[PDB]
RNA sequence: UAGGGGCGAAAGACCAAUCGAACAGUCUAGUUGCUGGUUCCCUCCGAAAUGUCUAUCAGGACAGCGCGCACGCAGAGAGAAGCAAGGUAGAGCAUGGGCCGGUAUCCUUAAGGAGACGGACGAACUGCGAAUGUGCUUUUCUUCUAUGCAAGCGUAGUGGGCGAGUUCUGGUAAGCAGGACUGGCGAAGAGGAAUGAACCUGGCACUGUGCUAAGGAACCCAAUGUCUGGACAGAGACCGAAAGA
RNA sequence: CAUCUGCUCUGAAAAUUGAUGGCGCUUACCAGACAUCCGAUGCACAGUUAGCAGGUAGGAGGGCGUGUGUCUACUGGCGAAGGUACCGAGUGAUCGGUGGUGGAGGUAGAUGCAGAGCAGAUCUUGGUGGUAGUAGCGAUAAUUUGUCUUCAGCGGCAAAGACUGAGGAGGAGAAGGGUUUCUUCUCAUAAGAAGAGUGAGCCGGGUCUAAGCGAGUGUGUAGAAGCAUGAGCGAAGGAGAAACAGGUUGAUAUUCCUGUGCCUGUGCUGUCGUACGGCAACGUGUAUUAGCUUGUCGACACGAACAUCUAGACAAAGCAGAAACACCUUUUCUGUUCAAGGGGAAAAAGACCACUGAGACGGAUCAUCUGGCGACGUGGUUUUAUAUCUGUGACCAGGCCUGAGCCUGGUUUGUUGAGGAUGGUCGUCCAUGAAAAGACAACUAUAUGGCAGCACAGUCCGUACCAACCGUAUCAGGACUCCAAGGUGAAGAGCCUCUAGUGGAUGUUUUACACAUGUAAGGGAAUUCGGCAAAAUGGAUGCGUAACUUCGGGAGAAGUAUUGGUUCAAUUGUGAACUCAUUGUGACAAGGGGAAUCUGACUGUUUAGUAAAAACAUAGCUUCAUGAAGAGAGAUGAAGUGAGUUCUGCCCGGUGCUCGGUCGUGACACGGAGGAAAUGCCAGAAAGCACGGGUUAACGGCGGGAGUAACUAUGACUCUCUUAAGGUAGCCAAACGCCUCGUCAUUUAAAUGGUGACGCGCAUGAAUGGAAUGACGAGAUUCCCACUGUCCCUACAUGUAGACUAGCGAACCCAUUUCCAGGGGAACGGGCCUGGACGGCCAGCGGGGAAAGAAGACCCUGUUGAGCUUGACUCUAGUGUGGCCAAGUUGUGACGAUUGAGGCGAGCGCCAUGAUCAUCACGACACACUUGUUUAAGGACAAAGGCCAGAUGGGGAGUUUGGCUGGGGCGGUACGACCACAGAAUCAGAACGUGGUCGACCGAAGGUACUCACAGCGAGACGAGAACACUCGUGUAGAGCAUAAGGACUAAAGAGUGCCUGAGUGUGAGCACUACUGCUUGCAUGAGGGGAAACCCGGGCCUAGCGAUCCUACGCAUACGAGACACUUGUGGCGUGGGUGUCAGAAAAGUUACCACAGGGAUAACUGGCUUGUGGCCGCCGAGCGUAGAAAGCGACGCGGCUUUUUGAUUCUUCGAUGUCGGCUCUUCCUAGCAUGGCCAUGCAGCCGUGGCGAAGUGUUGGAUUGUUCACCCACUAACAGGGAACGUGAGCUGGGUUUAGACCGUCGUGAGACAGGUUAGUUUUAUCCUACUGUCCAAACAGUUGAAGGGAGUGUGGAUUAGUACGAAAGGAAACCCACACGUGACCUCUGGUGCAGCGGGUGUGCGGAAGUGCAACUGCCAUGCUACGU
RNA sequence: UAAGGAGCGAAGGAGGGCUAGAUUAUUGAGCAGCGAGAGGUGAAAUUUGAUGACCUGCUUAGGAGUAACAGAGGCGAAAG
C-alpha cells in the first residue's frame, strides 16, 4: 500500500511555523537583577499570556520573556535571584521555599532557563527538603514526583489563564480556530473508513477492525496505529499509586 | 509538497481532455504452445485424424502410414489339402443361485410338512455345441506375377475426425455419449433418386463414331404401349398404434 | 355359421397460403406379368501421345519471366526503350510482328551473383468513385423605402420601424495576443501590397522587506542527494520625494504646445539673525551639522448604529434656443461651468488648563453610561473637514455676417441625498488581526544660518490597438477588476423610457409527424411502478392559532376577511362618503396545506463527465503512550463511538497486548581436553521462548433433552447432559423472518400495500453501542383535502422548423446481381430445386437486410498479467539484545583462575589459609567525549559511530496457488497396481460402465521327508439337555488352503509329526506392447540342506503389496593422488538402503463487483433444430356405482397414442456482439368451441341443466394489492374460453424487476472479501442506402362507357304481445312478426357544446406636451366563416 | 395587666457562622532487627508469607473523628 497520514505529518514542510513568535521563553542568566515589567501579551499559538522584561547588563538596557503568573500587572518591580524576597512573582532559589509552597517555570538544573510548569492553570509543590544531599522533591501535575538540586531556580505563583476548559465549543468553526496552529489533523477522518491501501483498518463489507487494536512497542512504523503498547483496556478501576519522596 | 511518491470533511477521488501506480526517452525488433497473411507454369507419385510417455488434454517427442535415391530379388491383402486352439448363437437346467403347483406313499398332527414329477429361469449358471473369423505346414499344390517387389539411408505432413451397412454398452429417448468389423466423404468429378458431403450406377488427359447401366417412356422433358385381377375414399401413387364394424 | 388371406373404411387435432416435384390422372392408383425404346466422363473401335493419365496436406523432375557480373554474336536520328490499338505462335507461364505516339538508347546465346514474380494481411503510402446537386447551411432584437456608387456588396448616405435598458449588446484598465491601429491602391477580400505611426525629474519598472529560495564555506557521498550556516534574490494590486487645467494629429499624449506650479540638489547677488511672552493649557519666530540613549510615525480583524461633508437627483422663478398646434396649453425639452497650487471661516466631535466646590443626587446618549483620583457653571488652550476668495482667463450656448471676424448671456432660492469620504462610540473571539527601508522629537556638544531674486541639473526601460484572449475556427462554453440617469415597487428584482451603442442563406400562406406554447362540456387520479408533467396557492393589513418539546421553538401552524378610482376629515393611528358591465398585490413579480411511519441530531462535504445519499465530517463521550522539547501534562501525539436525555448486563477458555521471576532451553565470541596439525568434540550462553499472574468503551463470544397444576391447554416446579460464559434491560415479520402473501384488528366496494398488536427471534440486542422524543432534510414510504387533458376521448388555434424554390454544399457505409410460399441445406435464404407473381417517378414510414457503431465487458482456456489480504513459500528495511574496537589516573572489598607449607574419614576426596594473574560494584580526581550553565557544567558514564552473531519483522519485495470432468465450481478419483463381467467362441478393444480389492502380514503361514483325511448323515455309549468326550458304517470334497476375486489341489498342495535355515555365493540368456519392476530358465562352485534313494530347494500353490539422475549412509576389493617421499583427511569403481501416492519423479495459500491482455462457438447464460421422461389433451377394456340396471352420467386395475403451449435432457449454428423480463400500442393466424346459430341423446313434464355432432363469421370488459407472467378478491356482463407469430413487437416507447462502479443490515470468513438473502441511489445513440408497405404522377389525346380480377360488414341485448297460457299434485312456468338501446362502420354541420386566426369592446405599468389616435410587457369580455363530437 | 413591643444592669449555656492551632488512633510507604507462620470462627475453608509475613524500633504521607469525664444533665422553632 502507501504511506499512512500519520507519517506524512511528522515531515518537515509540516512542522509549526514561527513567524509570529515573540522570542524564546526563559529566565536571565545572570546571579543578581532587578527587572521591571514591561508589556503583557498574548502570542498567536500560546493561550498563556507572555511577559516582556527589561534589565541592565553593563550599561545596556536588555530584553527577556516570561511567561505570566496571575496577578502581576504593568509596571511592576520584580527582584531575580539569590536575595530576592518571598513576594508573588519574584524568582529564588528553590531551598529558600517552605514546603507546602506552589511554584511555576522550574529548572531542571541550573541556569537552563525554566522547564517544567508552563501551561495555563497548572503548578508545582514543594514536598522535602534534604539537608544532606541539598535536593528538593517536588510533586509535577501529572502526580510525578522528580528530584531537583536546591540551586535551581523558580517562579513564585501559579500560571494565567486557567478555567479554559469550562466552556464547550458547541460547533465545528470553534473547533477549527482551535485546532488551526496545532499538529494534529482536523478534521479527523477514522481508519475503518478508508481502503486498505490507505491504513491498516480499511476494507470490508462491514465497517470493524477484524485483528486486536492493541500493537506491539517494537512493531514497524508505517503500521503503528491503535493502542500502543497498552498495560490494560477498558473503563474499569486501576490500583494503588507507590510512592517515594 | 513529485511517482512505489504527493495530496485527500475518504469517492480508490485528484496530480495538464491520461490514475487500483503520471509523462518523456531508452533497454527492445521484450516474449507468444494463440489469431491474421505468405507472390510463376506444366509433368509424375501420394497421406493421417491411431498406440506409448509427457504440470499432459488448443502443444511436443518416439513408433505407424507418403516421397526421393536405390544394393539387390522368387514372391503373393485369393483358394485347396492335412493340423491346432476357441465357448458366442442355438440347445439345456446333473455342481451353485432360484419361482409356482403336486398322485401314490411317508411323517406327524388330526394342521402342516416331505414327495417318486410337471411347468417357468441367470452378463458374473454349464453336461453339449455351430456358422463366420484366427494361426501352422506344403508350390514335393491350384492360380497369378517384372511397366513388379525392394533391405538400407535422409526427410515431410498427421496425432479435433465424421458417416453407411452389420452388431454391442450407458440412457425414456435424441441429428445423444462411447467401442468392434468391411467399404466411403475428408482429398471424388460425371449420369440418376425434383432439391441434399456420405444413398443407386460407376472412378475423370484430349477428340470422333457406335452401345449399355441406374433410372425413365400422356404433357412439362429425349423415349409407351399391351394383357389379367383388385380398389370409390376430394383416396392412392408420399404418409402413425392398440382396438374394431 | 365359424375362422383365415387381399384392397377400401374408423380410430386421425396447430398456429403466413400450399405441395405424390407441378399440372393433372378414377383405363397416369394397387398387385401379377409382357413388349421394345430413350438415356453417362462407364464399355467397344479409331486418332493425338512416353502413355501407365482424379487428387488436399506433403515430396520430386523439366521449363517461363526480373535487376546486375564475365565473355561471344549484333543493333539505333533512314527513329531505341516505353505506352496504345490490331494480327500471328505456344497445353501454359509468356513470346513475335504491323500502324499511329515518343525522342535516346537496346538485345540474342552460354555461364556468375541475388533486396528476383501478389487479390487478400480491420496491410503501408498516394490518387479516385457510388451515395448526391442529396442531408444540411435559419437559438438570439426585425426590418422597410428612396438614392448613389458598386458593377452589381440588405456597401455607403437620408427618412421611418425596433432592440440592449446604467449587475448594458455603453465607456475604460490587467493577464493573454503582437501590428491586428492609420492612409493609398487592388480584389485576391476575416486577402494582399506599399508607406507612416508609440516623445515623461512629478505615471509605472529599476528600491524595501513577507512567506520562502539560495552561491560559497563546513560535514557527507565513488560521484550525488541530504544536513548546519549564509553573500545575494523574492510583490507592474503590500510600504514607497514631487502636477494640474485648456488646447493640437490621419493615427500619441496628465509624455507635445500655452498657462500656472511643485520635489531633490548646485552656484551667484542682495538682505536680515545669534531671542522672548502667558498663573497655565501653550504661543511668537520659515534655522547648522554630528552623536549616544529613550519614545513616536511608517504600521494594519470582522460586525452594528449614529453624526457631518461631497458627487448625484428633484422643484420653483429669470433669460437664450428648440419641439408640438384640425382643436387645447406661459404644455414640453436642452443649458446656466471653475483644476492643481496659494489663502481661509463659522460648525460639529473630542482632549486639556484656571477659578469654583456638588449626593440616598445631579449630568448626559438612538444605545451604553458619568462625578471628591473633582459635577454643574463662568472664561480660555489645542487637534480634525468643508463652504467662500484668488488662480491674471479659458470653455460653453445663441445671433450677425462669412470662403473673417464681430456682438450678447452664463442669474436667484428651496427639498433630498451615495453603492464614495471622515469622526468619536458600542459588540464578538480557548481566533486578538506583517515586516523593513526611510523619517521625526527630546537630551548633549557645535555654529556664517534663514529668506528673496536670478541661473543650472535630474540618466536607463515601458507607452499604437483589442469586440483581435484559451478551447484545431469568425465556436451559444470559460476568463481578474472600475464608473453608473428617470418611473412603478421594500428592493443596482421583473417590466417601460433618456445618454451611448447595435443586426442578414431568397422567395413561397406553407399537408403529415415533430419541438416551444395557449384553451376546453360533463366527470375528477378511473391514468401510471409511482400524481411524472401540469394546475391550484402567492404581496401587504387585521382577526384567530393544536399535539408535542431540550421551554429556545413548533409558527407564515391551520382556519378566515380586506385591497381600484374620486372628494373629504384627521395627522400617523387612520376613518367616512360618492362611483364603475364581469372588479381592483388587475400586466410584471409572487408559499399549496394537513395526519403518520423508517432513517441521519443540526449548518457543512463528496464519485470534474450515469450515484448528493441513510455515506464522510462535526460538537460531545471513552480508552492508550509519555517528564522528552524552539513545545512542557488545562501538554503533545495514536485509536474507537457519534449532539442532548436515558441506560450500557455476563465471559480472560482461543488470539493479541502487558507484568514478573528461571526451573529448562537458547547464538557467535571467550575458554578446556586430545592429537604432528587441520577438521571435529566438550563446556559456556543475553534477549526471546516456555512457565506464573493482569486485561473486553482489545479482536471477539453469550446451550440441549425429558416429565409435572381439581375439563383441556400451558408449565411457576423437578430431573438429566453440558461450559470460558450459556444473550440480562430493552426492541421486532423492522432498511435485520427462510417458511411467508405469518395470525388478529383498523384503513378500501375489493388491500402480495400502510399503521396498531402478538413473538422459541432460519440468523434481534447494548460505545462491533441499545431504546424513546423535539427542531432541521432537492433523503425513503402510506393516506386525506384542494387542484387539474394524467385519463375517459380527444378537438381547435399560435410561433419555429419541415414540404416546394434561388445561392452554397458534406459524411457514415459499400463482395453485390436483391418480390414471395414450401423443400432440402452449417438444423430461421435475396441468390439453389418445384410453384404464385413480375415497370419507372415524388413524398412519407420503421416489417426485413439475423442494419451500422466496437478484434464480447459475462462465461471458459493460456504452465499471460496487475491491485489488495494472510496462518502460503523464500528473503529484507526498521526495532530490540550480546561480545569486541580511540592505552584516562589512583584507592578499598569481593567472587573467580593456578600451584604449595595445614587439619578430617575406614594416598584418596572432603574440610582450613597462604603466597601468584585476570576481574565486578563502590569511591575521588580530570585528559578523551558531551552540552549556547561556555573565562561554564557534566565526565570514562552517556550520546554518536564501526565489525560479527542471535531474536522479531505482510512495514515492504519477489513468486506460487496440478490434471481429468456430458462448460466450470462443490463432490468423486475412471491419476500408480490386481481378479471377475461385457465388448456378436484366438489376442487385443472405449464411457465419471458393473461387482470388488491393494500401499501389508508371517522364524513359520519359508525348504524337505513321511503319516492320515475332511464337512455331514444313519445307529450306539450316566450324569448329559438342541449343543461335552468316545466308537462303528457311508462319505468326489458338499471342507480346508492367514489376507479380494478367479484358477489349482485327494495315499495332497489340506491336517499332524520330524529335521534344516536355499529367505546360499559368482556369472549368462530370455517372456509379459518391456525402461523400472516381476517371473521363467543355463553353467560353475559351497569342511550346503532334507530324504534309503531317484528327486527337490537361490522365499510364501499361481495371477497384486511398489520408485530414475544428482547428493548422502553402509558393505566389497582393484584404482587415483598434481616436483619427490611418509602418514591423517579426500577423490574413483560395483552393489544395496534413505524418496518423490500428481506414483516414467518442480520446492508452493487466497481474493478482485476497481480490473487489463491473447484467443475460443473446441465451452455456459437467449432463440431455433432433434427427443418427450415430466406437463397437457384423447382413445381401448368393463370390476364396481348410479332408487332398477355394466355403458343417461360414471368407470378402479391395466394397455395404446398424439401435442410442443411446462420444465428437463443434449451442445448442431452465433463469443472481430443476433440488445435480455413485464407492460403500452397494433395486426394476423390456430381449435382441443366459453357466448351467439342449426341439431342428436337424457335419470328431457315445464323452467334451469348435462353428455355429444357440422361449424372459427362476430364477441370475450372496468377496477383494488403486487415490477411481475401467475395468483386472489370487488363490480358489470350474452359470455367475461385457451393459445401461436425469433417465450410476435426497444434505429416504436417505457425503464418498475434482474445484472458494473456508492452505501446499510443479517449470516459466513483471522482477513482482503462472499451470499438465485433483504434495502436505497444509479447516461436507453444513428435511416439521408436497398427492399417491403401507404398514398401521388407517367406508361393511357378528348367525350361517353364496359367489367377481368382483387377487397368486403353489420353483430348482439332488452321491453311489449302470445300469457299467468300449454305443462304440472302444487310451487312455479315457456315459444315469431313490432318497438327501444349499446358496440362497430360510412358520412354530414341545420341544431347544441368546444376552439378564437379575421372583427368589435375593457382595464393595469410605462413611452410619444394634453385630449384623440396608438407602441411594448402582456392580461381580459363577446364573437362571423371554417374545423370538430360531447351533436345529427 | 401574673397583655405585648423597645431599652438598662450583672451573669449563664455541646445554640449558630468564621480564623488559627492540638493529644492519640486506623491505613499506606521507606529503612532496621528476627527467621516461621499469621488471619478468621461455634467449628473451619477461601485467603496471605523465604520477592522475609507476624511482632518490635525509628522516619514520614494523607483523610475522618473528638474515648474515658458523661448524667432520667444543659442548649435550640423543629431537624439537631
Known amino acids: 500500500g502507501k504511506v499512512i497520514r500519520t507519517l506524512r505529518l511528522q515531515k518537515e514542510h509540516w512542522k509549526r511555523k514561527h513567524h509570529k513568535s515573540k522570542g524564546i521563553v526563559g529566565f536571565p542568566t545572570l546571579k543578581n537583577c532587578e527587572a521591571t515589567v514591561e508589556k503583557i ?9 507572555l511577559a516582556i522584561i527589561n534589565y541592565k547588563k553593563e550599561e545596556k538596557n536588555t530584553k527577556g520573556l516570561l511567561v505570566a503568573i496571575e496577578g502581576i500587572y504593568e509596571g511592576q518591580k520584580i527582584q531575580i535571584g539569590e536575595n530576592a524576597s518571598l513576594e508573588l512573582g519574584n524568582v529564588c532559589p528553590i531551598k529558600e521555599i517552605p514546603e507546602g509552597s506552589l511554584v511555576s517555570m522550574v529548572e531542571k538544573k541550573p541556569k537552563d532557563g525554566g522547564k517544567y510548569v508552563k501551561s495555563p492553570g497548572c503548578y508545582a509543590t514543594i514536598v522535602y527538603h534534604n539537608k544532606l544531599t541539598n535536593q528538593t522533591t517536588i510533586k509535577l501535575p501529572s502526580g510525578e514526583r522528580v528530584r531537583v538540586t536546591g540551586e535551581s531556580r523558580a517562579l513564585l505563583g501559579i500560571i494565567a489563564g486557567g478555567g479554559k476548559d469550562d466552556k464547550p465549543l458547541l460547533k465545528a468553526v470553534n473547533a477549527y480556530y482551535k485546532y488551526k496552529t496545532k ?12 481502503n486498505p491501501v490507505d ?5 470490508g463489507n462491514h465497517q470493524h477492525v477484524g485483528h486486536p487494536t492493541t500493537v506491539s512497542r517494537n512493531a514497524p512504523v508505517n503500521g503503528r496505529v ?20
Open 41 to 49: 501579551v498574548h502570542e498567536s499559538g500560546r493561550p498563556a499570556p
Open 183 to 194: 499538529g494534529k489533523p482536523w478534521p479527523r477522518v477514522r481508519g475503518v473508513a478508508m
Open 199 to 203: 491504513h491498516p483498518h480499511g476494507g
Open 226 to 245: 491503535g493502542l500502543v503498547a497498552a498495560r490494560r483496556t477498558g473503563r474499569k478501576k486501576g490500583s494503588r499509586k507507590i510512592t517515594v519522596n
